[PDB]
């Protein structure tokens, strides 16, 4: 209805005659596909100096809260997340540590040949190792593949 | 001791071994001028083939979005293929890549690079030196393209550089507007008004916000796609002069087809091109870094300046200390020992023990074929401490 | 030094209302400053072929920017402030003759010497899809002194355009010719390197 | 043993460059473990032994 | 908007680039001008506080803002401390498929996105496609000419 | 502001960087009055004053 | 005070002693912002709330 | 905005500090609802509406 010009006769030239007005997208130049199904992809860029693992965890939690209030027929999936490769690799080292400790215990139980004897060193292993974690928190040193 | 030295000569030098990330990132770039519709058809086809593959769990595609530039190009498109769990899949990530490459890259004839995912462009990866050739002189990007293609050929002939590539492209098709200023003035038309008309029709113009959903959303004015669909579109557009007469845009303005670069890249305030290189298996990344430098120096020396980014800058400017550190560590050990022993002569016995463990490690490593990665370098240090204990206890 | 810069900046904005309006248009700038001049480097043409404006404009473009990227260097500046400019020397007499005000000259430069915005031909949404999307590239800004002379002030009622050349003399020349530098009795541009704090 | 072991570890940690940082976290973590283990060996193990 | 790359390199990129040429602890800068957009990532020496770095750049770009063209100024010249790297991509997809993609983008942008940039550690959260609701006035130049 | 002293209209592209375009009268600003008399401004009535 | 002006129906007056601490929730009350995402007019929002 | 409300045209310097120059109408002419019939704006045709 906006009137660009008022003619000599009392007729108002309006946008509707010259153009067609509708509510669309500001840009039509990019789309997103997830598994062929159309989808809107949101890319998260880490703030410089921020831990990747912590950030990803926070995003996933906020996604779950949002999902509860999602309109029917809307679902969220996090297809690509670098963190996953880190979590798994870190976990693998943790598994190695448990396995290593168990194997060491067996070698010790062979050499000591007495049940209790083997325990004495056993108890020492986690006290020392866990004290190390406390120290690296004081230093501010972070858990990483190399520390683990 | 001679064996240890020899093994160090042969053992390849590397930073961190590659582990299958579990996700392959494929960059698909259709021809330079290709429009978005062609780009999407291309990716849907890849996606359909991808779901057929039992190996790939899911696929996310960002169409029209180039990863490296982080800019929207109609021709570019990036698809991430999320592979299955390491246990769930019998194929390594690289084996999966081969099947995919054979299936469509040869056939679809659409540029596609299958790369791994790097958390950090340089730290995560190894050797992917991405040096910039920043021109000092002011020359046409076309000339730069030529010049940087010569250096690319020389890089190919260099003995140990791999997959050397330049991201610069000066092929994209662009219409060059020729502005007849005299004609325009004859028609009594301001130049700002002219372009405001063209920005309004061929382009998108943001006038003001409108209120929807308790938010402000822009109001954009653009011509119907059909009018701006082809060239000569100027003939249809009309701009009123100071006089009531409407003047066709075509009269004062001419569009001629030219080739230019869509992405103008500048590094350190100088127009620049991105030469991306990888070290051939025969050479260490460093050697590769200095090899490319001499290729650039030989063919781009007069006007272009070599510059380095990422890991490469860190390596070149590292001037790292601590070479003496290792010797110092041993000297420290020598002294703390000669105070425990109270005899200057005996710590020598424990230090002599240390090469034996080093020998065993740099032996197994050169046997398997493992390079001297940080892992080996570090692991070394624990073997040196453990050997010490065996030695100190016995000598005491 | 940095905390101080933050406190000062926060206080300029807390008192934005108290500031005069003209000051608001060109924002107040808070910058860490260093008074110390670590060194004075003077670039001098031995051939005496290069004129001072040229030497100054070689420094700014090349020599200066790299020195400002040297760590520990505070603002590095050449004293002359002789940057290249397309000075348009108006001739009041001619202007009166041809009946043109300076304002008309200024307006003409604003419209003629500018790079405007042009869209992309063959872009979505389109009913009939075209194989290629073609950008439109335009060069409005005039690189040459002669082009500036060519700018048309007005038609003149005979199809014979009036031009900046008719009422002025355009030439490349420094923005401020006020200051010069001497090294041992020889022309030079003096570049002062301030030391960054800490 | 602890002094000799930490003696080798500390210079390696002080190595310059980002590789130095990667080798600093590992070098010092080992150092912390050996010092702590020593104290544990001195006090905790005999008691329980 | 609506501008050729070179134009964006000259008018928009260089003034900004020269303003931040002397920022403290700047190792190197790279600017990428594309038809419509300019991105300039300033890299800093390792160990430079990320927050301080941004504050410097923000202070420096302020002078350059005026020299910028009006359209560029109206739109947001933004200094965010986020790397161009993508930690993770989340995709929201319509299962009923009842919704149109413009609608789906307009739901994520308005609700899902804003709660993401708030999450600590997400420097930037960008949706792909720029499909925000816009009034579009589709001009027909034949009708404009007829009605003068 | 234009005749007496330098006026900065817009930038130009010479040598890869943007430089200023400055407009100023030439030598007609040496005398105090002469200048005031020489310069003519157009009125709304299109007559120079 | 409350009883002097309770009579007046022209001034709505509440007399409160100054808070013990500058920022407080002596009540322990909850503050909830009922955001509206439908872009409704505030008058409509009032009714809904 | 000029008559019924306050319009800040520019700044006048007083006592060494720039104060504001505001333009508003007399309070009688904005006291009631029919205030609008007093105000008149000139058309392009130079006729007061």
The DSSP code sequence of E116-131 is HHHSTTEEEEEESS--
**DSSP β-bridge partners for residue B166:** B275
Q: Which two tokens stand for residue A124?
A: 């020492």
Q: What are phi and psi of H28, to 5 degrees?
A: -65, -40
Kindly report the CATH number assigned to the domain that includes residue C131: 3.30.2090.10
Q: Which of C189, C159, C158 is nearest to C83 (CA)?
A: C189
Q: What residues of A are in contact with residue C134 (Cβ under 8 Å)? A: none
- The closest alpha carbon to B197, from B236, B239, B227, B232, belongs to B239
Q: Angle formed by the axes of helices B323-340 and D2-13, to 10°?
A: 170
CA dihedral B289, B291, B294, B296 (to 10 degrees): -60
CA distance B219 to chain G (A): 18
Query: Are F18 and E10 within 8 A, CB to CB?
Result: yes
Q: What 3-state DSSP class applies to H9?
A: strand
Give the tokens for residue B321: 């200390």
Do the Cβ atoms of A98 and E119 come closer than 8 Å?
no
Nearest residue in H to C23, CA atom: H18
Closest alpha carbon to C79 in C183, C173, C171: C183
**Beta carbons of E14 and F18 less than 8 Å apart:** yes
Output the CA torsion sign for A81, A83, A86, A87.
negative
- Residue G36 sits at the vertex; the CA angle it makes with G34 and G37, to the nearest 5 degrees, is 140
* DSSP run (H or E) holding B259: strand B253-259
DSSP structural state of residue B372? B
**Rounded Cα–Cα distance for residues B113 and D30 (Å):** 42
**Residues 217-256 (B) with a CB less than 8 A from some CB of E:** 217-224, 227, 236-238, 240, 244, 246
Strands (E), chain A: 3-6, 12-14, 19-25, 32-34, 37-38, 40-46, 74-81
Query: Phi and psi at residue B100, in whole multiples of 5°?
Result: -65, -45
Q: Residue B273: which residues within 8 A CB-CB, separation 6 or more? A: B132, B133, B135, B144, B145, B148, B166, B167, B168, B265
Q: Which residues of B fall within a CB distance of 8 Å from F15?
A: 138
User: What are φ and ψ of residue G32, in 5° steps?
Assistant: -120, 125
Q: Measured between alpha carbons, how far is F14 from C84 in angstroms, rounded to an integer?
A: 9
Which tokens belong to E47?
């160990």
Structure tokens at C80: 């002359």
**Are B175 and C135 within 8 A, CB to CB?**
yes
Which residue range forms the structural domain that includes residue C120?
85-174
B191: how many CB neighbours lie within 10 A of its CB? 20
Terminal alpha carbon distance of chain D:
21
Alpha helices, H only, chain C:
2-14, 21-25, 52-58, 65-67, 92-97, 102-112, 145-150, 164-167
Query: DSSP string covering B297-331, please?
Result: HHHHTTTEEEE--THHHHHHH-----HHHHHHHHH
Token couple for B236: 């249809």
Please name every residue paired with A47 in a beta bridge, in sequence order, or none if there are none: E82
**Own/partner long-range contacts of H7-16 (Cβ < 8 Å, ≥24 apart):** H10/C21, H11/C20, H11/C21
Which residue's structure tokens are 């206890």? B393
Query: Cα separation of C146 and E80, whole Å?
Result: 43
If we measure between CA atoms, which residue out of B234, B222, B264, B171 comes closest to residue A28?
B222
Cα atoms in the 13 Å half-sphere on the side-chain side of C132: 14
Instruction: Report how far residue C138's alpha carbon sits from residue C95's, in angstroms, rounded to the nearest whole number.
Output: 31
Question: CA-to-CA distance for A103 and A126, rounded, in angstroms?
Answer: 15
DSSP string, C98-129: TT--HHHHHHHHHHHS------EES-SS-SS-
Query: Which chain F residue has the Cα nearest residue E7?
Result: F13
Please judge whether B36 and C133 are an interchain contact, meaning their C-beta atoms are less than 8 angstroms apart.
yes
Residue B272 bridge partners (DSSP): B134
Is the preceding peptide bond at C125 cis, omega within 30 degrees of 0?
Answer: yes
- Residues whose CB falls within 8 Å of the CB of residue C89, separated by 6 or more in sequence, listed in order: C168, C169, C170, C171, F24, F25, F26
Helix (H) or strand (E) holding C193: strand C189-195
- Give the experimental resolution in Å: 3.1
d(CA B392, CA B337): 8
Instruction: Give which of G32, B7, E94 is closest to A74, Cα–Cα.
Output: E94
> Strand E133-139 to strand B215-223: parallel, antiparallel, or no bridges (unpaired)?
parallel
Pairwise CA distance, residues A74 & G33, whole Å: 25
Q: Report the distance separating Cα B269 and Cα E28, nearest Å.
A: 10
Interface with D, mutate which of B321, B326, B329, B394 (most D CBs under 10 A): B329
- Identify the DSSP state of E10: I
d(CA A73, CA C129): 32
Q: Which domain holds residue B208?
A: 173-260
Flag if B264 and E17 touch (Cβ within 8 Å): no
Number of Cβ atoms within 10 Å of the Cβ of C54: 15
Q: Where are any strands of DSSP class E within F1-49?
A: 7-12, 19-25
Task: Count the alpha carbons within 13 Å of H3 in the hemisphere toward its beta carbon.
Answer: 12
With the C-alpha atoms ordered A138, A140, A143, A145, is the resulting torsion angle positive or negative? negative
Please tell me the experimental approach by which this structure was elucidated.
Answer: cryo-EM
3-class DSSP state for residue E42? strand
Cβ neighbours around E131 below 10 Å, total: 26
DSSP H9-28: EEEEEETTEEEEEEE---GG
Q: How far apart are CA A35 and CA B57, in angstroms?
A: 9
CA–CA distance, B83 with B30 (Å, rounded to integer):
24
Residue F29 carries which DSSP code?
A: T
Backbone phi, psi, residue D45, to 5°:
-65, -50
Residue ranges of chain E whose CB lies within 8 Å of a chain C CB: 1-7, 10-11, 18, 21-22, 24-26, 35, 45, 52, 55, 59, 62-63, 66, 71
The answer to whether the beta carbons of residues C138 and B179 sit under 8 Å apart is yes
- The strand pairing partners of B247, in sequence order, are B239
DSSP H or E segment with residue A116 = helix A115-139
Three-class DSSP category at A34: strand
Task: Choose among B358, B356, B338: nearest CA to B347.
Answer: B338
Query: Which residues does B36 contact at the CB level (< 8 Å), separation at least 6?
Result: A28, A29, A30, A31, B63, B64, B74, C124, C133
Q: Torsion over CA of B83, B88, B89 and B93, rounded to 10 degrees?
A: 40
Output DSSP code: residue E8. I
Identify the chains in contact with E, defined as 3+ C-beta pairs within 8 A. A, B, C, F
B64 to chain E: which residues are within 8 Å by CB? 128-129
- What backbone phi and psi angles, to 5 degrees, belong to D21? -65, -45
A 10 A CB-CB count for E104 gives 24
What residues have CB less than 8 Å from E31, skipping those under 6 apart? B265, B266, B267, E9, E13, E16, E17, E38, E39, E40, E41
Give the orientation angle of helix A83-112 with respect to helix A115-139, to 10 degrees. 150
| DSSP 8-state class, residue C197 | P
């Amino acid at each position: 209805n906006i009137i660009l010009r008022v003619n000599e006769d009392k007729s108002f030239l309006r946008i509707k005659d010259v153009a067609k007005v509708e509510i669309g997208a500001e840009q039509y130049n990019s789309t997103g596909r997830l598994n062929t199904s159309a989808a809107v992809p949101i890319i998260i860029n880490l703030q410089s100096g921020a831990n990747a693992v912590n950030t990803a965890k926070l995003i996933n939690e906020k996604m779950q809260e949002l999902s509860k209030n999602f309109p029917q027929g809307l679902k969220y999936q996090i297809p690509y997340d670098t963190t996953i490769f880190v979590k798994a690799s870190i976990k693998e080292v943790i598994k190695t540590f448990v396995e290593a400790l168990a194997l060491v215990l067996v070698v010790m139980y062979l050499f000591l040949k007495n049940f209790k004897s083997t325990i004495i060193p056993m108890i020492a292993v986690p006290v020392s190792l866990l004290g190390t974690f406390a120290v690296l928190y004081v230093l501010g040193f972070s858990i990483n593949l190399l520390t683990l | 001791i001679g064996f240890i030295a020899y093994l160090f000569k042969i053992v390849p030098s590397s930073l961190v071994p590659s582990e299958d990330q579990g996700v392959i990132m494929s960059i698909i770039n259709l021809p330079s001028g290709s429009s978005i519709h062609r780009t999407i058809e291309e990716v849907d086809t890849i996606n359909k083939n991808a779901t057929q593959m039992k190996e790939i769990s899911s696929s996310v595609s960002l169409i029209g979005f180039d990863l490296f530039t982080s800019s929207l190009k109609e021709n570019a498109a990036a698809v991430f293929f999320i592979l299955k769990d390491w246990s769930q899949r019998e194929a390594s990530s690289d084996q999966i890549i081969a099947q995919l490459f054979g299936q469509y890259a040869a056939d679809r004839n659409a540029l596609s690079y299958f790369l791994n995912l790097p958390p950090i462009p340089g730290l995560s990866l190894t050797g992917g030196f991405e040096m910039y050739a920043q021109n000092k002189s002011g020359k046409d990007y076309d000339a730069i393209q030529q010049d940087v293609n010569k250096m690319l050929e020389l890089a190919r002939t260099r003995k140990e550089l791999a997959n050397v590539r330049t991201t610069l492209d000066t092929s994209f098709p662009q219409y060059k507007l020729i502005i007849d200023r005299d004609k325009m003035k004859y028609y009594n038309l301001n130049m700002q008004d002219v372009f405001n008309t063209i920005s309004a029709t061929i382009g998108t113009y943001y006038v003001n916000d409108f209120p929807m959903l308790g938010k402000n959303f822009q109001v954009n004015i653009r011509a119907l796609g059909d009018f701006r669909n082809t060239q000569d579109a100027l003939k249809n557009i009309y701009i009123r002069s100071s006089d009531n007469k409407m003047i066709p845009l075509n009269s004062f303005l001419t569009l001629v087809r030219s080739a230019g670069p869509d992405d103008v890249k500048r590094f350190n305030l100088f127009p620049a091109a991105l030469i991306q290189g990888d070290p051939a298996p025969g050479y260490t990344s460093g050697q590769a870094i200095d090899a490319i430098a001499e290729v650039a120096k030989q063919s781009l020396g007069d006007e272009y300046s070599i510059a380095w980014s990422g890991s490469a800058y860190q390596e070149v400017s590292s001037k790292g200390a601590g070479a003496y550190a290792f010797v110092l560590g041993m000297i420290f050990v020598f002294l703390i020992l000669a105070a425990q022993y109270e005899r200057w002569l005996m710590p020598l016995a424990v230090i002599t023990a240390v090469p034996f463990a080093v020998f065993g490690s740099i032996l197994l490593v050169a046997l398997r074929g493992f390079d001297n990665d940080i892992y080996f370098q570090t692991g070394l240090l624990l073997l040196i401490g453990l050997s010490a204990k065996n030695a100190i206890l016995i000598i005491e | 030094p940095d905390q101080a810069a933050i406190d000062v900046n926060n206080r300029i904005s807390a008192a934005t209302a108290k500031l005069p309006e003209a000051v608001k248009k060109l924002g107040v700038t808070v910058r860490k400053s260093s008074s110390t001049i670590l060194e004075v480097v003077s670039v001098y043409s031995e051939d005496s072929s290069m004129n001072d404006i040229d030497i100054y404009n070689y420094v700014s473009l090349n020599i200066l920017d790299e020195l400002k990227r040297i760590p520990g260097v505070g603002d590095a500046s050449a004293i002359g402030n002789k940057n290249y400019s397309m000075r348009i020397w108006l001739e009041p007499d001619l202007l009166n003759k041809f009946g043109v005000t300076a304002n008309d000259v200024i307006n003409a430069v604003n419209d003629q010497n500018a790079q405007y915005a042009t869209g992309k031909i063959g872009e979505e949404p389109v009913v009939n899809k075209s194989p290629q999307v073609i950008s439109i590239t335009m060069q409005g800004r005039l690189q040459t002194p002669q082009e500036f002379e060519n700018i048309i002030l007005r038609v003149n009622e005979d199809k014979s355009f009036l031009r900046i050349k008719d009422v002025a003399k355009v030439e490349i020349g420094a923005e401020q010719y006020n200051s010069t530098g001497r090294l041992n009795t020889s022309a030079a541009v003096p570049i002062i390197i301030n030391l960054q704090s800490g | 043993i602890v002094l000799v072991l930490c003696a080798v570890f500390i210079p390696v940690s002080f190595i310059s460059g980002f590789v130095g940082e990667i080798q600093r976290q590992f070098a010092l973590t080992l150092a912390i473990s050996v010092a702590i283990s020593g104290f544990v060996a001195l006090t905790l193990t005999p008691s329980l032994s | 908007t609506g501008a050729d790359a070179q134009t964006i390199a000259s008018t928009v990129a260089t003034p900004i680039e020269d303003a931040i040429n002397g920022v403290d602890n700047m190792i190197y800068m790279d600017s990428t001008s594309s038809p419509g957009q300019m991105k300039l990532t300033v890299y800093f020496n390792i160990g430079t506080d990320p927050d301080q770095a941004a504050i410097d750049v923000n202070n420096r770009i302020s002078a350059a803002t005026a020299k910028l063209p009006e359209a560029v100024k109206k739109l947001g010249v933004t200094v965010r401390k986020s790397s161009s790297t993508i930690l993770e991509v989340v995709s929201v997809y319509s299962e009923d498929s009842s919704m149109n993609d413009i609608d789906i983008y307009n739901y994520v942008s308005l609700n899902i996105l804003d709660e993401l940039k708030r999450i600590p550690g997400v420097g930037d959260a960008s949706a792909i496609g720029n499909k925000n609701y816009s009034m579009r006035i589709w001009l027909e130049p034949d009708l404009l000419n007829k009605f003068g």
